[PDB]
DNA sequence: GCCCTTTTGCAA
DNA sequence: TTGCAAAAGGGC
């Protein structure tokens, strides 16, 4: 319980406060050493700061000769530390860098850097305590702080913390060569949460069909079974189009009550029932894809709900629909004039459309819902995108939080115009309601770096304007290189594993300043589970962690 | 009143002047200090300037070996403040550098750098008192000086005050990280600003629903609640399409007598009460688009007037509207030929059609042109709300009311931008016709403003480029830095910069704004919530942290 | 994004 | 039958 060295010096290095330490023989004797990274205590005038070891080099102290004193002691055989103690006192030197970082304030929010440069005599270096480590961190163990694979260096009982604070309406960034362990502590907080806070609901842009259920060697376990092990029951919502081959796969590794904990629903409408639906995604698909509806789409996109009241009319819409190539149900029937025809069958078919009001242009244009043919399923008669919205923004639903997947491998090539229809009509219906509900949901998406780019930015609008109603975002990319810096400049977390690449570190370092520190620990260590973790603003500066296993979180979290 | 340390040299560092600046062990005993980023009085023959302190480093003075003599005294364990004075008093020092910004000279005017060079012997640093830091800012509190969360930097009698010469006719710059205080800081200028001079006026163009109530806590409370807590009555305009939902929130939070703070409009007209409307918002949409309208909405557009007074003309005509959809109310009556229709029912409408130039006919056939207006259209309205916010913001019958205008976009849903952009080309109009006869004297508030200013040609660009000359200001928020024009950067008048971690952010600040170069770190390094970066023209044309204060605590103290 | 084609409808 | 306007899909 004393300082550690002696500072002899202090300066202002770009951004930040630096000051020099000298280790002297006695306590270079005795076994005192620092870690790189380490964080240690300065008091400088009776306050407390924060600071971490970045460099170490040998110097000498005073007027002396290290290497001929070494090269002579080598030469004459003379063994130092037994022979010439009084040689051995004047070599034994190491001098350390240290960096600020800021000062914690009682009752308060760290207070990042510091203003105020300490002069040399009136500094101390103490090292760092269990209980302060611990009161650093903490104001459901995420991880544990360790420095490298040191002995030493390890502290099993500093823990950081889940919470949803943390999380719910805030971006966060995950980036990590392949293989590190990025999906493994994304599925580790997102058990947790669920675990901890029911009352946090999330949408999961599953990319890769690695989420629900997971049995290769390649990946830790999935949430349907992480769900199932820890208890939770009525939680998990699958929108698929391969229901019948996933219920099979869900009742044989979950048992014969596999209904308990996952609702399988299915990705298709029968658009003879939603023509209105069938004509606004048409209508959108032009705004998506960057060009202006025709006028065609959109009177038709205004006026369908009156044109219902029109059997011509609505013979027609059908009609177009029928011929863009979308299948009916067996025992549909038209009421064109006063006649009614049965477009199921080939002759009836044939009789009204050779017996054929803006319903006209669209029965000849109709050549444009081809596209919806991947959605289009006969006899279902229910609107997908209204059961997500309302397990997402439900007014009954606040509270009891609810956890949507999304399989969007089976959607073919439109997972990317169905996503970003979703994604416009939730934030949409999100500011609709803002004041009478916060929506309190968190949008998980793996290999960001495709959806984080379209025309208009759905994703833009919501990455920069989702803080205030609530909706926060945690996308994996993998590489830090690969997404645009105006949304990495507004992530507040960050958990960054092992980056072999040296653009990767720079692009990190020049979008987040105190990233600056861990960059060499980057490049040269690549260790597994190994993460820096970054929380604004409760917690501004680079922590290590090693983040626990999924088994071993559940065989925990079980008692 | 006496120096704080000793000057020791001094040189021309590129365009800015500079001087080291040395404190003597007796003086660090003492207690005294300097912060970084710290205003001081520089005094060389004759005349005070203005300097901001930089850096800080130590350096051996004279024959010394500081690392060797506290080695050893460690190594003695020898307290170094009660045992060895003379050696402590060796090795206790510390050097400073100083930047001289220039000096003020007449009536405050502020001389920028300095052409001349100050010798070390004769110049000296003096701590800047109260009296001087308020003269410096000067020449209702909108922030108080501090310099970052240092105990002792914080000066709250120092603060600077919302006038409107500083907004009104200047385009002010908002930027900073997402959750910082850029929303709270536009609504406390916005409430001093109607509160202390009621004869401006304001377009708040909202985009997110929360300028008139907010009662999440996830931001500062709205300005119908701010004007209720201050008393101000009868100058908030509010224009959505959801006047019940509006009407409920505004009952049941304002209280019972809502409708003296906020009087609520629609953003629906009857197209049948305005043809010409009709027809010019058809034509503008166009142009707004790629360019070159059809020949025949061009001629629509020019003799609609002259068609007035044709009723077959006008019949075809409201047979064209009535034709892309939109409904007429309940009796509705139409001259063709020599009889008189009833397009409000069925068979009429059908006998009408089965009846039917010099323009109506083709009007009449491409009707589904108008389609896109029935998300305007609701009948029996008869408003023109376009028409009643230009009389609002640049009516003649003012002369200096207040009036405060906000429009609620979300509800338009996809109109809005092509609603924006005819409003704001409609008001500049105005504006410009009349420029010589009174000015339009209102604000612009803009937020996102990075979806606006993209086009060089669009009618926002063309504002704030040539606002000044007629009296119309603005004051936009976007975030970014790196998403604004350099055209648009370097003519921005007043800065207001949050906490940014982007350093493209930082150094394209700087690239606009030269004084921005020395306070990049600490933007880059303090992530602080509602620390400001004020830098306002001509008069005071440097930097000058700020601590922006919580609307809430601001209402509290006007009460008073 | 930008630049040609095809089609329909109303002259003549 | 031809010429011209105006809207919407293709190629690059
Ligand atoms: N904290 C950890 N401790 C020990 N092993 C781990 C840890 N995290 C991950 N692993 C191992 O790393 C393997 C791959 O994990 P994984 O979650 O797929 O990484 P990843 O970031 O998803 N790679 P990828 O998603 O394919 O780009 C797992 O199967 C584990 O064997
Ligand atoms: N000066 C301040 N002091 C204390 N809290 C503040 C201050 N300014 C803002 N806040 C708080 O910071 C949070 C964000 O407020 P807000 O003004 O909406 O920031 P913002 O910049 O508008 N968010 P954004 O629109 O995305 O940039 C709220 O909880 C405010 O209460």
Avoid: C
């Amino acid at each position: 319980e004393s300082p550690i060295g002696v500072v002899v010096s202090s300066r202002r290095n770009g951004p930040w406060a630096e000051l020099t330490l000298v280790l002297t023989p006695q306590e270079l004797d005795q076994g005192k050493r620092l870690l790189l990274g380490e964080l240690v205590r300065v008091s400088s005038g009776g306050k407390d700061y924060v600071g971490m070891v970045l460099d170490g080099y040998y110097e000498p102290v005073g007027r002396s000769d290290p290497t001929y004193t070494l090269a002579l002691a080598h030469i004459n055989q003379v063994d130092l530390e037994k022979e010439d103690p009084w040689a051995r006192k004047e070599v034994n030197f190491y001098h350390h860098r240290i960096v600020l970082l800021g000062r914690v304030v009682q009752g308060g929010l760290f207070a990042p850097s510091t203003r105020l440069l300490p002069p040399v005599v009136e500094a101390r270096v103490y090292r760092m305590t269990e209980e302060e480590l611990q009161r650093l961190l903490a104001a459901y163990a995420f991880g544990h702080l360790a420095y490298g694979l040191e002995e030493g260096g390890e502290y099993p009982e500093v823990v950081k913390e889940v919470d949803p604070a943390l999380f719910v309406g805030r971006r966060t960034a995950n980036f990590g060569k392949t293989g590190f362990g990025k999906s493994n502590e994304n599925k580790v907080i997102l058990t947790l949460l669920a675990h901890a806070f029911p009352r946090v609901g999330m949408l999961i842009l599953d990319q890769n069909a690695e989420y629900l259920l997971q049995t290769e060697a390649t990946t830790s376990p999935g949430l349907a079974q992480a769900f199932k092990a820890l208890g939770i029951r009525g939680r998990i919502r699958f929108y698929t189009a391969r229901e019948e081959a996933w219920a099979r796969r869900l009742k044989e590794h979950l048992g014969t009550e596999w209904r308990e904990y996952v609702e399988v629903l299915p990705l298709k409408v029968d658009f003879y029932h939603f023509p209105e639906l069938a004509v606004a995604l048409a209508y959108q698909r032009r705004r998506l894809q960057g060009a202006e509806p025709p006028q065609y789409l959109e009177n038709a996109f205004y006026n369908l709900e009156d044109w219902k009241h029109i059997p011509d009319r609505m013979a027609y819409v059908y009609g177009a629909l029928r011929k863009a190539g979308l299948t009916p149900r067996k025992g549909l029937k038209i009421k064109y004039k006063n006649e009614n025809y049965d477009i199921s069958e080939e002759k009836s078919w044939g009789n009204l459309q050779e017996a054929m009001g803006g319903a006209r242009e669209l029965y000849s244009r109709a050549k444009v819902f081809s596209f919806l043919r991947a959605f289009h399923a006969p006899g279902k008669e229910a609107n997908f995108l209204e059961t997500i919205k309302e397990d997402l923004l439900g007014e009954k639903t606040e509270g009891e939080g609810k956890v949507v997947i999304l399989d969007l491998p089976s959607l073919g090539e439109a997972a990317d115009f169905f996503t970003l229809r979703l994604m416009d009509l939730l934030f949409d219906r999100a500011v609709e309601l803002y004041g009478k509900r916060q929506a309190n949901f968190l949008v998980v998406l793996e290999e960001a770096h495709n959806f984080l780019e379209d025309k208009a930015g759905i994703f833009y609008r919501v990455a920069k304007e989702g803080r205030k109603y609530g909706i926060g975002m945690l996308y994996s990319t993998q590489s830090p290189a690969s997404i645009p810096m105006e949304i990495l400049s507004q992530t507040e977390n960050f958990l960054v594993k092992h980056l072999s690449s040296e653009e990767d570190v720079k692009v990190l370092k020049r979008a987040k300043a105190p990233f600056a520190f861990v960059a060499d620990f980057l490049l040269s260590e690549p260790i597994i589970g190994y993460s820096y973790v970054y929380f604004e603003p409760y917690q501004p500066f680079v922590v290590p962690l090693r983040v626990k296993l999924l088994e071993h979180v559940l065989k925990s979290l079980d008692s």
